[model samples]
Each structure stands twice: as C-alpha cells, then as structure tokens.
Target: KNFGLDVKITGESENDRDLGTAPGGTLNDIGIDLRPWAFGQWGDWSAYFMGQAVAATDTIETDTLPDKSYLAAREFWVDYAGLTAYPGEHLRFGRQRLREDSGQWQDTNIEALNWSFETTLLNAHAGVAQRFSEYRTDLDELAPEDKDRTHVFGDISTQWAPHHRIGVRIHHADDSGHLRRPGEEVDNLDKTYTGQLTWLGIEATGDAYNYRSSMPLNYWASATWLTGDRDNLTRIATGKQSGDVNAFGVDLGLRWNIDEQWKAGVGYARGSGGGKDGEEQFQQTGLESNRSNFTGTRSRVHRFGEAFRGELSNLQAATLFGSWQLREDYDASLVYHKFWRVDDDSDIGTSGINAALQPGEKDIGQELDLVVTKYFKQGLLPASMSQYVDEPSALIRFRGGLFKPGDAYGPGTDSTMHRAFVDFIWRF
Candidate 1:
C-alpha cells in the first residue's frame, strides 16, 4: 500500500469585523489530513485500502470547520478492485467518498454498499446508504433521531474527441424525524410550524477543451434542478418547513490560455431564489473539499474559485478575470464581478456581500479584486529548501469594493468596503 499527508494553516482577517479581543477571536486555524492508500493481490482477487485521518475545527462561532480541535477518521474504506469476467468491467464495495472528493457537485454524507462499473462508452455508480441515527434506539441518547436517514444516489457520464465530457448525477437523503421527544414540529420564532425536509438533487454538466484553437480555449456549462420534501428546516423568512421546493440553477464559463504567462476567463451563474410562487431555489452542498476547483458542478460558484463565498442559491453573478505570471516564480491577477439578487425577497444583510445588493436595479454595482501570489525558493522559503523550490509559501490577498446601495438598504450600507488576508498551506 501507499500513503501520504496534507496540512494547511491560515492567519486570516476581514475588516469591519472584530479582529481584536485577542485570545479567542483570532481567525487563525489549522487543518491536517493523513491518508494512506495501497493495493495488493490476493491470489485471483485484488484488494485496496484508502483512509484519511482529519483534525480541524467545525464549530459555530468560527470559520473553517466549526467543531473544536479533534482527530477524527474522515475516510475509511476498502475496495476489491478485481473480479471482471467480461471485457472492460470491474466491481468494488466499501465505505468511500461518494463524489465531492472526485470533483463532483454533491458529496455523499456517509458511505455504504455501492456498485460501480465503467465501459468504453459509459461509466456509472449506484449506492444505498444508512445513517447512524436510525439504528440508535436509545431514547436517552444525545441525538434522539429516528427513521433510517437512508440515502440513495447514482451518476453516469461519457467522453469523446477534442476532450469533451458530459454527465449527470442525482442524490437523495431521507429525512429522519427530530429525535426530540414530543418533538414539536419546528416552529418559527413568531409561532409558525413546518415539517422536516428530505434532500433531493439532480445535476448535469458539459465540459470541452479545445486543442486546435489558437489560444487553447475551454468552455463549460451546467444545469441543476432540486426539489426536496422540506420540513422543520427553517431557512425561509416567510415560513417554516413550508412545502416541497422547486429550485433550479445554471452556470456557463469560457476561458483561454493565450500562452503560459497569461490567461483569462469569464463566467455567469444564476441560482433561483425563494418565492411565494412555491418556487424554491437551488442549494449547494455546504461541505466540500477545500482543494477542489470550480470546473463544473450544477451551479459551481465560489469567490474567485478560491475564497469568500460559495453558495449558488438566491443569487446571480457575472465574472471576468485575468492572470499573468509577472515574474518567473510569481503570479498576479485581477477579477471583476457583478452581483444581483435573484429573489429580492430573500433575507438581506448590510455588510460584505449584502452591501452590494440594492432593490430595484438589481445592480450590486461592481467589484474589482487584485491579488499577487509568490511561491517557494524566495524569501518565504527556507535556505535549505531554496534550491528545490517546490515548498509552500504564504499568499497575500487584498480587495476593495465600491457600492451605492439603493434606498432599499439603509445609508450606512451604501458605502464602500475593504478586505485583506494571508493564507499558508503545505502538502506531503
């Protein structure tokens, strides 16, 4: 078997937010993952094991993962990679990362029995999962939930010449009733009631790479439709677990590498917002691989493909960006963005993203971001590792925005904003 490790550390700060009060308010955080994988032969059968040990914070008050510092096994599974009697066929089973780890939209919450296969023209997988809440019958347990949080999912895809790819994925999570005894149906603070919600999602996408184009271009497009039986989940300002949701989203991207030293791209995305019309909006998987890129995933949305915000619901975005390798070992970039509220009825905030949204015009104004990143072998690298130059280094990012919010928001929100941060990471 073979294995390795990955870890990251960051010292982050955002203006207008309290960076003072020392001790606990520090946005500083650390995350690490140790994974080992290998394959071996057992006579006519082949077996493989892959696992990950993770320690990070995933708590309520802070960023990154919310929980406190604790080492937990995030991935633990086995696969029997052998057993193909037919041509181009194989089978494996065990706990595994459903798809997020593989660059897909939604990642399954838990692992379970799965069947997967790949052929010359098609590839697909299907699995049935069971959550722990359903099996725990102890009424006094800390989490008093019941009903199999059963989940089922599947996907299929194909690829052709010119590096073109297309695929579709569907995911479903059954809702387990609140374990709270006499579990009062979740009610709004104003005294309204709603049922539990079931998670259901369907995603489709297409990607293309041009080898024959003058600048070596690429394009991607995707659409997703989600409708889940929502219950006590109180996200809507209108009502609690209102009813079934009908959310739809779409994203389009175009980019080209003029050369090794420069590149540019533009993208547009739209996620349906809430409405009294029984038209709910798309919701992305909040949990995702930090290292994953925004190639395509239903309505793949992220702040500069890196940080800031990454949700695809109740929103619309238009982005244009360009990057240049200013120096042999350093890169500089600039991005422009336009934001609009798909459903103006959705809850509204003042600072950060909210400041941009005004009512009638739907013109969140515009934002221009600048960033410069330098790599190893430079001052940030140790002398011993200078010659190797593959080491990690700190990333410094600076951003400023201009906005003129409509009367919809108060006067304070019609102003400008600035943000800065430093990030560091390493893998081995």
Candidate 2:
C-alpha cells in the first residue's frame, strides 16, 4: 500500500523588517504529512520503498521565548534500480529530493541520494545531501542547529529543440554546528554556482485572436555564482572577515492566453548583495588565494576578513500575473509586485545600529497577490483559497479542506495572514 496524508494552516503579517529584525508576527500554523510507498519490478531491476512523517506548530513568537519548542519530524527512505553497473545508467540512493542541477536552489529533504544521465540533447545529475533537520526562520535567533550538514549537488544540460535550453549547476555545503554570534563561531563551508538559459516560442500561434488563443511566449536567463569559506560569507559581510564573494542575477518574461478562460504573465528580477563585513561582499579571501574571486582587498583584521563594508544595492522587480478558469473545478489568480531598492551605503530609514544611507537614499517597497481555487472530490468541501495584500504585506491561505484536513486559516492579521490544509493518498 502506498499511503499519503497532508494538512496545513497558515497566516502571516509583516511590515517589512526581515533580516534587520522586528515587524513580523501575526501567526497560526499547523501541519502534518505522512507518506508510505512500495513498488517493485524485477524484470528490469526496479525497486522502491519510501516513508515520511512531519508535524509542526511552534514559533508563536519563538514559543514564548526562552529555549523555544514546537517542531517535529520522522523521515524515511529507500530506492533502487538496474544495478547493471552502468549500461545506459541511472542510480538513486536513499533519502531523496535534493534536486540540484540548477532548478535554482531546491533542497527539500529528509536526506538524499541521486544520479541521472541521458542522451539525445544531453542531460546529467549528481547529488548528495544531509541535514538531520531544522529550518523555519523569521529569526528564532536565526535557527540552524540540528547539526549534520552535508551537501553536494550537480546539474548539466543541453537541448536544442523542444523550446531550446542550456544549463549548469553546482552547490556545496559542509559545517553544521549551527550558529554562534557575539564573539564568533559560525562557519562551516557553504558553496553555490548556477547558470542557465532558456527560450520558447517557436511560432506563436494560438488562434491569433479569440483573446490571443492558447498563449505561448517565453524567455529566461539565469546566472548565479557564490563561493564559500568563512561560515556563510560572514553574515553577508556585516562582521567583516571575508574570502570568496561574487553574485549576479537577471530574469525576464512574458506570457498570455486571454481566452479559453484567461491567463497572464510578466516578470523581472535582479539580485546581488551579501554580507559579513558588509559593503556587499559576497565572500573574499587573499594573501595566498584560499577563497578566490570577488577581487582582492584585505586588512580589516585579516584571517578570512570582511565583517562589514556596505555598498551594493540594485534590485528592480515587476510582476503582473493572472489566471482564471472558474469552471469544471473553479480557479482564480492575480498577482502584482513592484520593488526598487537601488540605493547604497546601508542605513535604510534610520533606526539604531550604525545607520548610513548616502548613495541614493532608501525606500524599497510594493507587493500584492491574490489566489482562489476550488476542487471537490474527497469528502468535506475539498478546496483552496489564497489571498494576500501588501500595505505592509499580509497573507491568508486555506488549502485542501476540513478543519485541518489539508488545513489553513489566517496568516496573522495586521490585515491578515493565515493558512490551513489537508492531504491524504493511498495506492497499492
């Protein structure tokens, strides 16, 4: 028997202040997940066994301070296939879903092992992961402990037809003692690398009008490079002490399908900024080249260097997305987001702790999203609803069904932030 179950509830509210603390609260959460699986086929050598369990509800302001509590999990894994050593090739170990190869940062885990290969346009995969557990941060003092951090991911690509493609990826990690600040301790190796290219729209024809007919407009671009050493790039350079730092990003898009219900898309992206000693130092090291690239500059007290230096802000964003089906099962979606930070020198709106805004001067805001969905089949009221507003960011969600079936409620009002959800499946 292959089994499944799921539940979710969420609510959130925010008035900015992420990373710089404060302005975050309004909460409600409950989650549960369970999965069981079994499959077999001897003729070509195939096998599988899987297991998973999850429990949640904690972080109500850090469980009321003092030693916190509320988080749960019990995971499982097993998989196998054609051990022919390497005829055509495919290998999978236990504990899955690290999914690297530049899917753009994916590390959904319970542990992992993966391998893949293909021909005809080329394809590749490599994987490794470990992370006993822990991750849910809005600042619970920055959470990390659960120890056991190991990661190595890979991706390679090629495709010339079916819409064109290009790819590259690499991710590395080690050092899992968690954190310690206020006199040092917090570096255990972390790495990153990514590259991408994609294009689609071989003839743009969906009826031509009739609302634009079936829509087909696509384009993508990606670039990521991060090197590590100095325990997470010295907190983005705020504590100065660097070695290896580099960053770059870009994204663009457009999609539309006005008739047959409705559909829409628009996109943009830009990212480059990291810390430790600041000055936007992603990471750096010299005096013999141990960290590499982000270009030489030492002295703020050597030994891996860069605690904070500041300067590096350029993020421009835009989005207008939509979807509407309203029948057969119901559906709806609307999204809008706009952000422009561009200033430098740090000091964003002054509020203690070294303020400095001089390269252009503050203000980086705007966001909005709304979604509604409904589908019935399993009992209760089987469904979905998602809502969001951004005066200062608010959220709400209800997914699946039943009082915690899949579960959700409020994200936590200051406007509203809530979520609820439920899920279950069985196959044999």
Candidate 3:
C-alpha cells in the first residue's frame, strides 16, 4: 500500500449567494483529505482499495451537513479480466466508481456489479448500483434520495467511421420506499416520493477529443427521453398520488482548436418541464457532479455557471468558452453562460443560488466565470489515471464567478452576487 496526503487550503466568498438571504456568508479555512491506496495483481485477478480521512473547518461540498471530521471508505473493488481472451473484458464487484464522459448519467462511487468490454472499434458497459450504507463516521443514515434506490444502466458504441462514433444509452432507477403520507410532516431526512424512472438516449460525436487531441474541430450531440411512473406526496391529498413521467432533453456542442495554445467552444442544453399534479420533473441520475473538461483543458470545470451551478431540469442554457495553455505548466479558461427556465410557470431545479423565483418568470440570469491553474512536479502516472485522481504532485487553482440576476427575481434584490475560491493542493 502507498500512503498519500492530499492537503487543500481554500478561501472562498459567497457574497449574498442567496440574494440577500439571512444565511449567506463568507468562509475561509483549510481542509485536509488523506487517501491511502493499494493495488494488487495475480494472474487474471486484480484488486484495488482506497480510504479517506477528512479534517476540515466546514462541510465544503454538502452545505447541509455540519462541520466535523470524518472517515470514509472511498473505493475497494476486485476485478477479473479473464472473462474473455481479448484482454479487454472484465467483471468487477464491490464499491467502485462508475462514470461516463458526459458526466450527466453516471459518476459516483457505490457498491455494484459491473461488466465492461472495449476494443479499437467497439465499447460497451453495463452495471447495477445501490447505496447500502453510509460508510462514514459522520452520518448515521443515508441521504433521503439514496435510501432504497437502485440503478441499472447500459450502453454500447461503435466507431462507424474514422474519427466519428454513435451510440445509445439506457438507465433505469427504482426507489422502493414509500412516499410521505398525508398529515405527516416530512423532515429533510425523509423521502417524499417512491417510484421508477427510465431514460433512453442517443448520442453522436465527430473528431471529438479533449484540448490535447490533434484534431482541430470537434462536435457532439445528444437527445434523451425520460419515461416511467412516480408516486409523490401531497399535503392536501389523502394518499400519495401517482403520475406517468414523460420528458425530453437535448445537448449539443462544438469546439475549435484555434492554435497550438488556444481553443474555444460553444454549447447548448435543454431539459423538459411543466408537469402537473404528482408528475415528476426531469432530473439527473442522482450521481452527477456536472463537471467535465469540455473546454479542451486538463482542468475539469463546472458545465454551468460556477456561481449559479444550475441543473438541467426545466432549464435551458447557452455557453461560450475560451481556454489557453502555457506548455504543460499553466492553463486558464474564461466562460460565459445564460440560463432560462423552460416552463415559465414551473419551478427549475435547485442551483447554487438560494433566491426564490417569481411565478411565470422565464429569464433566469447570466454569469461569467474564470479559472486558472498552475501545475508542478508532474506525477509518474499515465494519462488514464487523471480521470479519477489528479496526476499532479502539487497545484494552485483560482476559480471565481459573478452572477447577475434577471427579471425573474424580485425587485430590490441583490443586483449582483459573486463566489470565488483560491485553492492549493499537494499530494505526497
């Protein structure tokens, strides 16, 4: 086993993040995250494990949680690659990370049984995952959304043409728990609904590669449909009401390699909305961080506004970004985003902002974000490892965003709000 300490000192400001709410405030503190990992191999079997210890002044990621130190099991899985002679097929079990490039469907660490097959011309994956326990010392129970939730997903893709590909993806999620009953006051730890949801999607790409790829121009497009059934809680109704789910969403983008050191891109995404009664709104798979390297840089930033941090449910967004790299040592990005509510009278998904929206309002807001990163002492790992862990010995990063609200917000509210963070990370 190899022992490593990842220390991060972050100072941030959330100036009126809630648009003048009573709880918005600023924070400055240092957080430390330690990871001890090991890898073992014998014949066709391989095993890997990693554990984490967190000591911090605040619950930086999940604001709902109180400040406390905790220990958690990050990953521990075993793999058997002997299922096929091609050296590319494998069966994995235990707690593992299941992810996709889009960062929209699957990206989380959970207990699962997963199978994968890959080749030069074809790639396929299928998996089932569910959260069984907290696996942490700080919490006694799982999040309400994760309790009794199970996910099954599969996808297959083929390189139909040189530098191009197309594929179909499917995901099914079931929540077997009962919904909140009438006359019952539900707390934050209690679930409000129970049902099943399925998503079917198709995607296409052309010469798509990150900023490091030699290709000059690249593009990607995806369309998805959500269908299933949901039983939701209602305060005035006698029992949980049932409704059919029908929703649609789409995302597309294009990138240009302006030069050896510069690149730019534009993207647009929309999700369905405006469900009546107990019908459900479109949502992600409950495992997405919505962070990716779409800007053609080594650093993966938030897809939506860093300050706004919007989700793609009952929401539409247009984005433009430019990125630059100074050799392999430094990189920077500038991004702009404009967001709108798909249904004027319906509520949008939760975002970083805590402000309440006006009924029948469509114009959400606009935001600008900037990110700069400096790398030092490149690690001895291959590029593939960067997907799960930073492949750098040390780095300093600055991320900031400014948001300007639109008419959707009430008058006399905070006209502009900002959030900024400076981080220093060292892995040893």
Candidate 4:
C-alpha cells in the first residue's frame, strides 16, 4: 500500500493606500492521496486507481469565511497491450492525466480515455469530457449566467525527434454557471485551438551530442486561438455585435543549461481579452452593460470609449529565471518578471467619480521572485518570496510533502509569510 500527504501555508501584504485594508493574511491547506492496484500481467493487462482529498482554510475573515473541501479522482484506468494488427500499441481508458506533445499546460481532469503506441513517436489521443461540472474558481465566480453546463474537448500531438515536437488542441464547451441569462441558461459551445513547437539543444560539454556542442540554447513556442459562438457574442454584446469572437495568444521561451547544476531561462506571452459583443466596442452608448456592478454598487465610471474600445489587448510578460544546485538535494532560484501592456489605456482610471470609466494611463508594473528548495530521497521542501509592484503586494510561501508531494499551494494575503510543512508518500 502507498499513501501521500502535504500541507502548505502562505501569507501576503500590500502597500497601496487605495487598497483599503492593509495587505496581511494567511491561508492553510492539507492534502491526502491514496493508491491501490487490482490486477496485471507481464505486458498483457493492468489496472490501478488513485484518489485525493484537500481541506483549505483562511485566517483573516471570521463570520463569512469557512473552510473548503474537495475530493479528487486522480487516476483510475485499465490497459491492454500486445494487440495483433497494431503491434506495440496499448488501449487504455479511464480518468487520467492528458499530457500532450508540447511541454505545456493540458486539461487535467477527472474524466478521459486514451490510447498509446509505446514503441513509436506518434501517438493519438481522443476523448470526450464534461464541462461546467469542473471546479474552476475564477471563471465560475464571475460568470453572469448559468454556472452549470457541459461540453466536449479533444487533443492530438506527436514527437518528430528527441529534440523536436508539435501538437494541436481543441475544446468546445458551454459557459460556466456565471455567464447565463434570464431564461437563456444554455450557452453555446466555445471552440479553442492551439499549436506548439519545441526544440532541444546540447552544446558546450555536449556529452549527449558532441557534434552540436557549438550551440548551447534550446527553445519552444506555442500559439492558441479561441473562437466564441454566435450566442456568446450576442450575450456579451447585449445584442450589439454578433457572429464570431476570436482570441489569439502566443508564448515564446528559451533555456540555457550553463552547466550540470546551473541553468537560466526566459519566456514571454500575451493574451486576448474576452467580453460581450458591442460591450467593449468603445462607443459611449454600449458602456451600460460593460462594467461589473457587483456588491450592488457602482465601483467605477462607465467610460464608453475607455471601457470597451475593442482594445482589451493585454501585456506581453517577460520572465528571467536562473537556478543553482547548492548540493545533491538542494537548490535555489531567482526570477523576475516585467509586464508591458500593448494597450496603453487599459489602466485609465481609479478612485472616485471617473475611476471605473477611464482606463489607467500607466503601464503594467513588474514583479520579482526568490525561491530556495531542499530535496530528500523521500520528498522535498520549498521556500518562496514574491513581489508585485503595481499591486504593491508581497507574498511568501513554505511548502513540503506528507506523501507523493507536488506543487499544490494556496495564494497568500499578507506582505510576507513564514511557513513549514512535511510530506509523506507510500506505494504498493
């Protein structure tokens, strides 16, 4: 039998006057995982199942604040190999982690099925899953309509060489519970597509590829496009603009392995904004529904041109990161980030009357991060510090495992935090 456990604590603080309350708070989380096996043969068939549970709490708020809990079906699947026509191929189906070709984010869900070819670089994955039912805190909290609905998603990718890879992804789904209308609770499925490329290189001490030691840099790039359906466009526009609303974004990054225990890397990306049609169109008449009126009070002025000029262009953030190995099981890193908004008017206003109406003229601010980690044969521990200039906020994190530990932590509220944790894991 195998089991794992982990707990993380975080804190943060802010230094901005308009932010009302001084930034300072803490959050704690505890997680547990269990795994069990059923049956298996040499290379014929096998089955395994896993589950996880988490409990989280915040210390700042008293009355309205309550602890949160979640149960996760991490992995449960069955596999069969040694097929006739498709030699060296395996058919596996159940809830599993869907890792595509490119080294990037993928839909990690509690529902999915997959197939694989263990001996070849080409592998095809196709699965249908439900949406709306998943726990997406951000989107769910802000949606204006029905929060429950379902959709289907699929993915495909392949590797061309040890150093090169590519893939395509698609997801069609209804809006989360937040974006629904009065009698129109059903949202049309929105479609998203993505393409990616990766290249690995070895140079300098080229122990792996002595011929290519002349180049010591490796890089990767990915682009994604999402299209909103006609209904979504109409709902967002409040019946203003209809048809198709599309968003495009790209990420480019490079890495240099200075030596065995040291490495440096950097990346940048920009994303398109989403909203109702005619909503952010920039015209004064369309500003009524473009603003968020939560708390039953007007938070800001509804500036027509300033609010929705169809120019919700976000910043392309650039990051610089470096790491050094302190010992066989310990290391440290320093990272910095700078955000440059393409649309200069995005932050036009703040404060009293016109605060919500106009976009702030200033650009996005910068951020800095420092992290140190120690690894043991059984688990690992990490200490982190981060600062955000525009938000005038600082945060700290301390995390460790109780079992098969991973990077699972909660956002902090204080300017700084001091934390310690222990993780444990078991397998059978």
Candidate 5:
C-alpha cells in the first residue's frame, strides 16, 4: 500500500473570454487529490483496492450541498485472471479509466464493467461505461432521479518492433439523450455530454531514436484521424439546429532533441468545418481555458498559451516551440501560435457560426507565450528518490502571453487579450 499528496494553487486572467465586448476577470483555482490503494496477489488471482477523496474550488462558482468544496467516492474494485481457455486474457470488474485509442479521449474517465485481453499478435479491450457520464452543471443537482447509461465501447490495436502502434476504437450509447450543458441534441447515437464524444477514431503512435559520437538524436510522433456522426457540438451555444454531425479532424506533431541545452519541435492541427453537411466541425471532448481545456462560450480558442485556449472546431492552428535548460532544475520555453478559421466569415464554433457572417474575414488572430519554471528538491522524512518529481519538492512557474485578434475576431470584439499567471505547487 502507498499514499500520495498533491496541492496546487493557480491564478489566471481572462480577456473577453465570453460576452464578446465584455471584460474578463482574474480566476483562482485550488485543488487536491488524496488517495491510498491496497494491493495483494495470489497464484493467478490478484486483488486490488483503492479509496479516493477529491476536492477543488473555483473563484466564480461554488457547490450547494452538505459539503461545499468536496466530492468523495470509493474508486475500488477487483480483478480476475483470464481463464485457462484464454491465456493472458483478463476480466476486470470495477471502476477505472476506460481504454482509449489516442493518448486522450472525450470521455476520459468512468466507472464501469471492463474486460480486457491481449496476446503476442494483438491487443483488445471493451467496457460498458455509462455510469461515468453527465455529472456536470448545477442543473444536475436538481434532477428528479438519477439517469444511468449502458454505453458499450471497445478497441483493437497491435504493435510491432516495440516502437510503433496502431489502433481503432468505437463508442455507442444505449440511451438516446441530449447534452444538458448546451441544451442541444446529438442525433441517433445519443446526444450525450461527457468530456468526449460517442463516435469512432483511429490512431498511430511511434518513436524514432538515434545517436552520434557524444550526441543523441531522438524523436517522437503521433497521428490521430477521427470522425463521428453529427451532434450539437458545433451549435452548443448558438446554432440554427442545423448541427450537422459529420465531423473529422487530424493532429500531428514532431519533436526532436537538439543537444543538452535546447530542444525544438513543431506541431499542426486542424478541426473539420467547411460549411457543408456532415463536414462543418471537429470538436474534441472537453474545453480548455488556459491552454486548451476549459468549458465556456469563448473559452475554446485552442491557443497554445495559457492565454488563448480557444475552440478547436472549424479552426486551424499551428505552433512552433523551443525549450532551454537554463539550469539543472530550471527551464525556460517560448512558443508562437497562429490561428485561423477553416470555414467562417464572422467567427467559428463547434459547428459553424450562428448563421451570422461579418462578411469577408479569414484571419482570426495570432499569439506568443513565454514561461519559466523552477524546481526544488529536499529529502524529507519518508522521502527518498532517484527521480526529479518523486522527492519532496516545490515547483514555481511564471507565465505571460499576448493574444491579438485579427480582422476576423467578430464585430463587437477586437480587444487584444493579455494574460499572466502565477502557479505554485508543493508535494512530498
């Protein structure tokens, strides 16, 4: 059995994040995760258990309940080995993160019945994960009764030479409903509201490594091609109910090591949106605010900085970033990002515009970001480690960025967005 503690404090600023011509404010976030898991094994039968407690607070909202700032649950279950008939296959019934083809997925977390199996030739797993959906929003607190799902999802994958992998995954909801978050409806598959979507996607990931006399050259790359039947994602907040569901997107990146002091990389991503039926939007699960994952009207900017975390649909984005190792435990980085619309004149959304156009407009905007991070380590009681973050330590980060909207930022909004953040963390 083992235990871990994590405490984090984050302060940030928003600029015209919502309400277009409106000014933004400073937002504060504090959170923690406390848990200790128990594990034991016997012959081919293994047993594991975990109890977890989570709590967090945001500056703008608070929960109204017996507990104002805490959410607690027991995330535990048991695992049984594959039967003799199926060697190396496993059947696990418990609450855990569902399997996803990409590094991340729309419905990233859940608690459900999961079964998995693997062999030298291929790997596969499936889960009936409906228990872990739709727990967001204050309205949920007012529900007459609890609604549960029986979503069935599975994936097939294989790897060769130990460095490359390819896989495909699919998801379907047993119940047909709409995402209460936006009051919009997803067709057929179930208009759902999880961080992810009810659809299908495929991914390929791998690494390339090389070495010189005293220098080493290494690279890592990943590609994701995904599409799903139409839903309300494009018009979550504002659309004509023509929320055509046909959508697809692509993500690709290449990172390289260039000596000990510096490293460089470039990445490009595009979410489908072209003002056509079934081809007008590409939305990934979840909204990001300070670096691409937040849930707000204007919070989908998808900027690569802590500032422009904008929308990812009907959008085109490219980033060039470099890192410098200033000291053994200190580092600095600078990134430049470019943003534009794939098919919109006034602005862009999960689908298209509100059927509103500002006429001839293409360029959305551009941004630049700078960040410095410091790390510290002190061996305290029960603290012994050979890695950086494993020991008792403190992390301090300072970040700043500028986002200048282009001619296409909409009619009532053209204010340049500026943001700065101070983040501090301590762990042992």
Candidate 6:
C-alpha cells in the first residue's frame, strides 16, 4: 500500500444580488482542505481510499453540496482488472467520481458498480449508481435531489479518423420517493415529486480542446433527447399531476488553434422549452458542474458565465473566448457570454444571479469572465493515473466574472454583479 497527502488553500470573495448593498450579500474568507489518500495493488486487484478534512473562516457551501467544515470520505473504491485479457478492461465498486469530457452528462461522486473499457480505437463504459449516505461527519441526510434516486448510464465511442472521435451516451434517472402526503406541510428542502427520466445523446468531436490536434480548425457537437414520466404533487398538495416528458437540447462549438500558444473558440447551446407547466423544459442529469477546458487551457473553466453560473434548461447561450498559454507554466483566458430564454414567458434554469425576470422578457443578460493560472514544480505521471490527479505540484489561480443584467431584469434590480476567487493548491 502507498499513502500520500494533498492540500488546497483557497481565498474567495464574492458580491451577489445587491452587490454588497444588502447585508450578507458579500463574503470574503479563506479556507483549507486536506486530503489523505491510500492505494494498494495486488495483480488484478486494486483498492484506493481518500478522506477529506476541511476548515474555513466561512461556511463553504453550494447549491448541491452542503457546508464543508467537517471530515468526509471523498473516494473509496476497489477495482478488478481481470475481467478480460485486455489491460484496459476493469470493474470497480464503491464510492467514486463518474465523469466524462463534457460535464453536462455525468460528473458526480456516488456509490456505484461501474465497468470501463478503453483502447486505441474504441472506448466504452457502463455504470449504475446511487447515493446511500452523506459519508460526512456533520451531515446525517442526503441532499433532496439524491434521496431515493437511482442512476444507470452507458456510453460507447470510437476514433473513426485521425484526431477525431464520435460517441453515443444514455443516462436514466429514477426517483422512487413519494410526494408529500395529504395534509402534510411542504418542506422546501424536500422533493415534491417522483420522476423516471431517460436521456439519449449523440456526440462528435475533432480535437475540440486544441491541446493534441495538429489541425487548425477543431469542432464539437452534441444533440440529446429527454423522454420519460413525472408525477408531482399539486400546488395545494391535494392531488397528483402526472405527465409525459419530452424535450430536446443541442450544443455545438468550434475552436481555432491560431498558433502554438494561442487559441480561440465560439459556442452555442440551447435547451427546448415552453410546453405545459410541468413538462417540456429540458434539464440536465443533476450531477453536472458545467466546467470544461474548451478554452484550450490546462485549467478547466465554467462553460457559462462564472458570475451568472447558469444551467442549460430552457436557456440559450452564445459564448466567445480566447486563451493564451506560456507552455505548461502559465495560462490565461478571457470569455464573454450572452444568455436568453427560449420561451419569452418561461423561467430559465438555476443561476448565481438573483434578479427576477419580467413577464414576456426573453433577454437574460451578458457576462465577461477572466481566468489566469500559474504552475510550479510540475511533474509527469503515468497516463492511467493522470485523469484523477493534477500534474502540477503547486499552482495559483484567479477566476473572476462580471455580469450585466438585461431587459429581463427590472431597472429596480442591480444592474451589475461580480464574483471572483483565488486558490492555491499543493500536493505532497
């Protein structure tokens, strides 16, 4: 067995909504996160474990994850590589992060039994997962979205041509929890519905990240369809409303590798909307962070505006970005985004902004983002281990964004808002 420790210290500052005018709208704090991990290998059998301890001047919480000031299990899993003669075939069980290149589909840590197969020409994966517990010292319950939820997914892809690949993916989510009972008061943090949703998608890519391709022009495209059924409690909680689910979504982008050190890209994404009150609006699989490296930097960035941090449901976005890198030592990117509602009268997905939308308004807002990173003591690792770990021994990063509200927001609301953060990470 081998053991190691990693450390991350971060300083974050943000102003939301009224942008410091309102109490509790601004925050500035520093935090430290520690990870202790162990790994063991015995021929075809392997095991890994990682634990986390966090302490901060303020509660580090997000929409999906709870406050991080206590100890938790980050990763604990076992793998069996003797499934087939191929070295790339394996089966893993326990808690692990299931992810893909695109953050939209699957990108969360959960308990699962997964299979992965990789090769020079073909790659495939399938997994079944669920959230059984919080695995944290401070929390006793799971998030509402994870309670009684089950997920099953599969994907297959191939490198059909030089510097290009194509794939198909499917994800199914089953929420078996029941709605609030009759005469039961509604709990905002608890779910009021159950759903069985399936997403089928097709994707094609040609060196979209701009890191490995010799071609000057690179592109990526994906289209997906959502279908299933949902049963929800009525507004009064007196009856159930059942409906069929049907929606469509698409994302496409192109990148130009202008030179060895510079790159630029443009992208557009939309999710269908505007049907009945309970159906037609497309949604993600609920595990996505929507962060990626399409900016051609080693550092991954949010696809939407960092300040707005919007989701893709019932939303349309156009993005333009340029990035520069000084070899493996430093990198920076500037990005712009414009957002709109697919249906003038409908609501958009979750976002960091709190501005209320006006009826019949489609324009959401625009935003500008900047990210810069510097690396030190970089190291190289085996390709198989690189995916789960950062290569740099230490680094500093700055991420910031400014958002300008559009006509959708009333003049009484804050016209502009900004959020930024600086982080320092070290691995030992």
Best by TM-score: 6
* Residue 166 lDDT (model 4): 62
Q: Write the per-residue lDDT of candidate 2 for residues 77-158, one digit (tens) a residue.
A: 4445465455445666654444321122552434567777766576777777665443332224322322445666666766
Instruction: State each model's CA lDDT, in order.
Output: 0.46, 0.36, 0.79, 0.35, 0.50, 0.82
Among all windows of 10 consecutive residues in model 3, the one with the lowest summed lDDT is: 382-391
**Candidate 2: which stretches are off by over 4 Å?**
1-25, 39-43, 47-84, 91-98, 101-103, 108-123, 126-247, 250-428
Per candidate, the number of residue pairs that clash is 16, 82, 0, 43, 21, 0
The RMSD of every model to the true structure, in order and in angstroms, is 8.1, 25.5, 2.6, 13.6, 8.0, 2.3
Compared with the true structure, what per-residue lDDT tens digits does model 6 show for residues 287-315?
Answer: 78777778877877888877888888889
Q: For model 2, state the Cα shift of residue 280 in Å.
A: 18
List the lowest-lDDT window of 10 residues for candidate 1.
Answer: 133-142
- Candidate 3 is scored at a TM of 0.92
lDDT of 4 by residue, 1-428 (tens): 12323322222221221222333322343444232323344567766555544443432111000235455445566777756456656666675554432212332433455565534565554554432233422123312321343334444455566555565655554534333333453344421111111111111111111112223565656666645443432323232223454555565656565765666776665544433431221111100121111001111111111111111234345657665654344455555555444444443212111112125433343444444444444432221100011001111222211111011111222222222222333222
* Model 6 poorest ten-residue lDDT run: 380-389
Q: What residue pairs are clashing in model 6?
A: none
* Deviation from native of the Cα of residue 300 in model 4, angstroms: 38
Alpha-carbon error at 171 in model 4, in Å? 4.1
Tens digits of per-residue lDDT for model 1, 116-210: 77775777777766544211111222222223455666777776543555777676655555422243554322222222333333333233223
TM-score of each: 0.64, 0.23, 0.92, 0.56, 0.65, 0.94
Q: On residues 27-52, what C-alpha lDDT tens digit does candidate 5 reach at each position?
A: 45554444344556566666555443
Q: Using lDDT, rank the candidates from best to worst.
A: 6, 3, 5, 1, 2, 4
